[PDB]
């Protein structure tokens with residue numbers, strides 16, 4: 001691989017949404033298989049100059065976003081630490 | 085592992101503090117890594133030399149810890165400023181910004197506390213069950229062009245309706261839900277149909 | 283000299299005067315944001331001395347400094363991978379443009395990929411990649427996403443933007459003709475869609491000329507990609523300073539350890555080796571701290587780029603001056619060696635004109651205020667026009683609403699409202 | 703001058719008086735052997751993280 005050499009992984013032609021990253025787009029998963037990662041499902045929108053797609057229903061989706069706010073207030077007494 | 089960010093920051097701090105405490109067992113070139121043995125085993129001059137080496141080592145250790153902590157505090161302050169911005173524009177109001185308050189057309193958001201952070205529940209509107217229709221920029225009726233006030237002109241094959249953009253709610257094309265703009269020879273794609281006058 | 287802050291113009295302010303643009307320009311403007319930096323790793327024990335056992339033995343006693351430096355650098359590298367992910371992995375599906383390109387006269391051929399196999403990248407992207415021009419324990423790890431896959435993300439985002447509008451960023455990708463998407467975006471900035479539908483050839487010509495102009499500027503004019511070049515130069519210069527710092531005495535007889543070992547007795551040998559190691563550790567820690575601060579800067583830049591991709595490629599932003607001067611219409615991403623280049627398409631009003639206004643119209647003892655426009659007059663007749671484009675219309679009951687009597691509003695003018 | 707590395711053939715053209723070559727960052731990259739006067743490159747043999 002451009003990232004080195006892999007010993008212990010079988011190269012496969014298939015492209016998967018990969019799990020363990022290696023580099024240069026090669027990234028392996030579980031025998032251990034190495035492959036070029038697939039960016040996603042390939043779909044082509046049916047574009048036309050007199051065609052529209054309008055949704056006839058909807059979903060109310062609830063997602064979670066985690067944001068760190070604080071960290072531990074730590075004090076170190078320099079002279080006590082360094083000298084005791 | 086849905087709270088990996090908070091666990092990550094607590095692990096980073098604990099690890100940095102553990103490697104700070106563990107450096108106290110490194111002699112940095114001195115005879116011993118404990119001060120009492122150097123004191124009770126060497127004469128005051130050579131004792132002073134060894135003490136000085138230990139002091140230099142431990143100031144490097146403590147200064148490394150403090151610099152790392154300052155950089156980590158900058159990271160967490162960026163995260164906290166983003167959290168404050170999200171609780172303003174996602175929780176105290178509805179946001180027109182895309183992907184800021186979740187995937188989809190944002191409806192609202194709810195805060196939840198966490199041990200050292202916040203968990204935003206973003207309620208969004210995701211359209212689904214889409215259908216194809218045939219559109220037209222305008223309708224030419226009585227030689228005058230007609231554009232939707234708010235919505236889009238669609239057809240199921242034989243009849244023309246006006247619908248809103250994000251939900252298929254057809255309506256009969258009338259002068260109430262359309263405005264006139266010029267004649268019907270300048271717009272490309274204009275189609276011929278009746279505009280009901282109530 | 284003393285610098286000039288700009289031309290001094292004083293606008294003709296009056297209490298009953300407005301200037302309403304009668305034309306527009308579709309301006310395409312570039313912005314360049316760094317996203318990631320080179321992934322570097324320095325193994326500390328090989329750097330300090332390397333292939334010297336005595337040095338390794340007496341560096342073991344300085345603690346776990348080497349391990350800390352290694353973990354900091356590894357965190358930096360993983361962070362660059364995550365920066366590229368956040369900026370570009372915005373869509374879960376790779377959209378592609380239709381083979382026939384009938385976009386209402388608009389020409390995206392200059393930002394879309396070409397089958398001429400230039401690593402499957404557009405011609406603007408090709409110019410951008412040509413403009414940026416670029417062993418001792420020190421290694422560079424390749425990025426997880428190759429240039430081709432960043433190109434494929436960029437192509438997917440372009441295809442989705444030009445075939446579905448903002449819809450594919452908030453749910454199911456919903457096709458819409460591009461002329462109609464542009465009309466929707468015009469309504470977004472407060473101009474009625476008849477302006478686009480009636481000026482479609484002119485707008486398409488202006489957009490195509492703007493893309494060609496940014497092409498020409500990028501191909502001929504230099505000093506455009508200085509931000510990415512600055513990042514690369516800073517990293518390379520820091521790295522060369524680190525390697526060059528390895529040829530220094532730091533107070534010892536020789537910079538190289540082999541001569542110290544050959545030519546000194548083990549007591550003085552270990553004294554001199556102590557001073558070389560302490561010097562080389564100071565150099566390495568200086569390098570890692572500087573690289574951590576540069577990592578923070580690049581992380582802020584990549585978070586800004588992710589925000590811009592979300593809010594300007596996947597939507598239309600009302601945030602003024604966030605995605606170009608002018609009223610934002612759309613934006614297009616293009617990849618760069620270590621960053622993203624946004625081509626912002628904006629609406630700049632032009633060909634302004636003198637008019638006379640009024641807060642309201644008094645008719646039949648009632649005060650009339652415009653629904654979605656402004657009252658203007660060419661001197662004799664009164665009209666209602668939209669704010670951002672001069673399209674005069676007869677004052678009627680459909681475009682005006684009544685809100686009380688005539689003796690409360692200052693500046694009311696004195697007119698008739700047509701009833702259809 | 704001492705070092706560790708692997709020696710290879712070179713197409714470099716030293717001037718007659720020049721002994722050994724250096725690159726940027728002052729690292730030795732080539733040398734003449736004093737026996738038969740041939741330019742030979744020095745490159746560090748492979749290292750890298752596992």
Ligand SMILES: *[C@@H]1O[C@H](CO)[C@@H](O)[C@H](O)[C@H]1NC(C)=O
Pocket residue numbers: 012013
């Ligand atoms: C992968 O593709 C190559 C041709 O490019 C073929 O020779 C090989 O047999 C394929 N291997 C598998 C496992 O499909």
Ligand SMILES: *[C@@H]1O[C@H](CO)[C@@H](O)[C@H](O)[C@H]1NC(C)=O
Pocket residue numbers: 056057058
């Ligand atoms: C919309 O979808 C829900 C389930 O997601 C379904 O129960 C409902 O009947 C659908 N609406 C229509 C009008 O079909």
Ligand SMILES: *[C@@H]1O[C@H](CO)[C@@H](O)[C@H](O)[C@H]1NC(C)=O
Pocket residue numbers: 045046053216
């Ligand atoms: C309707 O639209 C879908 C895209 O969602 C497309 O695959 C299909 O071919 C369209 N139907 C017709 C009859 O064109």
Ligand SMILES: *[C@@H]1O[C@H](CO)[C@@H](O)[C@H](O)[C@H]1NC(C)=O
Pocket residue numbers: 240241242243
């Ligand atoms: C379109 O809608 C009208 C509304 O009544 C209906 O009468 C007509 O049959 C529909 N056409 C098709 C092809 O379904």
Ligand SMILES: *[C@@H]1O[C@H](CO)[C@@H](O)[C@H](O)[C@H]1NC(C)=O
Pocket residue numbers: 049050272273274384
């Ligand atoms: C749509 O494009 C087709 C090209 O296949 C053309 O024949 C047709 O006239 C176009 N229709 C409109 C309304 O522009």
Ligand SMILES: *[C@@H]1O[C@H](CO)[C@@H](O)[C@H](O)[C@H]1NC(C)=O
Pocket residue numbers: 224275276
């Ligand atoms: C629309 O109506 C006008 C007048 O009747 C006619 O000239 C024109 O051809 C019509 N459009 C189409 C597409 O038939």
Ligand SMILES: *[C@@H]1O[C@H](CO)[C@@H](O)[C@H](O)[C@H]1NC(C)=O
Pocket residue numbers: 296298299300636637638
């Ligand atoms: C617009 O320009 C004309 C001529 O330059 C000037 O007389 C007029 O006062 C200006 N408009 C207003 C509202 O003053």
Ligand SMILES: *[C@@H]1O[C@H](CO)[C@@H](O)[C@H](O)[C@H]1NC(C)=O
Pocket residue numbers: 304305306484
């Ligand atoms: C507006 O500007 C364009 C070019 O900038 C020009 O061709 C046109 O004549 C101007 N006026 C109108 C009313 O479009």
Ligand SMILES: *[C@@H]1O[C@H](CO)[C@@H](O)[C@H](O)[C@H]1NC(C)=O
Pocket residue numbers: 383388389391
């Ligand atoms: C777009 O421009 C290129 C050259 O700039 C030209 O070859 C191509 O035909 C144009 N496309 C259209 C649809 O006019």
Ligand SMILES: *[C@@H]1O[C@H](CO)[C@@H](O)[C@H](O)[C@H]1NC(C)=O
Pocket residue numbers: 660661662663
């Ligand atoms: C002002 O607008 C009216 C209404 O169309 C028009 O008749 C007139 O010529 C315009 N100019 C002046 C100077 O009144």
Ligand SMILES: *[C@@H]1O[C@H](CO)[C@@H](O)[C@H](O)[C@H]1NC(C)=O
Pocket residue numbers: 297298692693694
């Ligand atoms: C504008 O100011 C002038 C004098 O300053 C005054 O005569 C006129 O009534 C004012 N107009 C309005 C609408 O306030």
Ligand SMILES: *[C@@H]1O[C@H](CO)[C@@H](O)[C@H](O)[C@H]1NC(C)=O
Pocket residue numbers: 644647696697
């Ligand atoms: C406007 O017309 C009304 C008609 O009743 C009148 O009261 C008023 O004086 C007029 N305004 C002026 C400035 O003459």
